[PDB]
Symmetry: none
Subunit: 34 residues, 9 copies
Amino acid sequence: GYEVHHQKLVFFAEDVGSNKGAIIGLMVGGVVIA
Amino acid sequence: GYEVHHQKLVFFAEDVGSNKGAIIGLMVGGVVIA
Amino acid sequence: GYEVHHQKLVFFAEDVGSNKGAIIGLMVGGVVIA
Amino acid sequence: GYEVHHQKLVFFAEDVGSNKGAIIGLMVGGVVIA
Amino acid sequence: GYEVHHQKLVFFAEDVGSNKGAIIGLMVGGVVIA
Amino acid sequence: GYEVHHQKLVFFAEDVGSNKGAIIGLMVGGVVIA
Amino acid sequence: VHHQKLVFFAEDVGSNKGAIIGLMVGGVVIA
Amino acid sequence: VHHQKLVFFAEDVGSNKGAIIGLMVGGVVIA
Amino acid sequence: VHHQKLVFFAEDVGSNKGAIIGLMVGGVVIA
């Protein structure tokens, strides 16, 4: 038998988040002047 | 037997989030001035 | 036997979220001045 | 002045491609038995 | 002045490609038995 | 002045590619039995 | 030269998505 | 020169997704 | 020169995704 639980993956926030600017989760080339 | 539960993936917020600017989940080239 | 439950995938908000600006789940080229 | 051209996003074989089995672009749940 | 050209994102074989089994681009849960 | 060209992101064989079994680009949970 | 039952199935065959060739001499068969 | 029952299945075959060739001499078989 | 029952299965076969070839002489088999 197996058992897996309570994992997590977070990216820039889990409770409170703001932003003034770029956030790119994945990119191939390009100019993020921001 | 197997069992998997309570996973999670988050991106920029889970409870409260604002934004003034770009948020790109995936991109292939392109100018994000923001 | 198998069992899988209580997964989740959030993107930019789950409970409360505002926005003044772009939000792009996927993109191929293009200029986001934002 | 901006320019963007000749991008691409090829999911699964932008040419002659056989298929005997499941292909899913997004799946929030289920059981895929290929 | 900006330029962006000749990008790419090839998921799984941008040419002749067989397939006998599952292919998933995103999956929040489930059971894939290939 | 900026330039960006001839990028790439090849996930799994940008040419003739067989497949007998699971391929997943992202998976928050589950049981993959290849 | 005596041939009998080159390929043989003795019960149910659930499906088929490919070539089931009893004998080949030449030519292309793209299943 | 006597051939008989080269390939032989005696029970269920769930599914086929490839070549099941009883005899090969020449040519291309792309399953 | 006398061949008989080269390949043999005596129980269920879940699935096939490749070549199950009873004999080879020449040619290409891309399973």
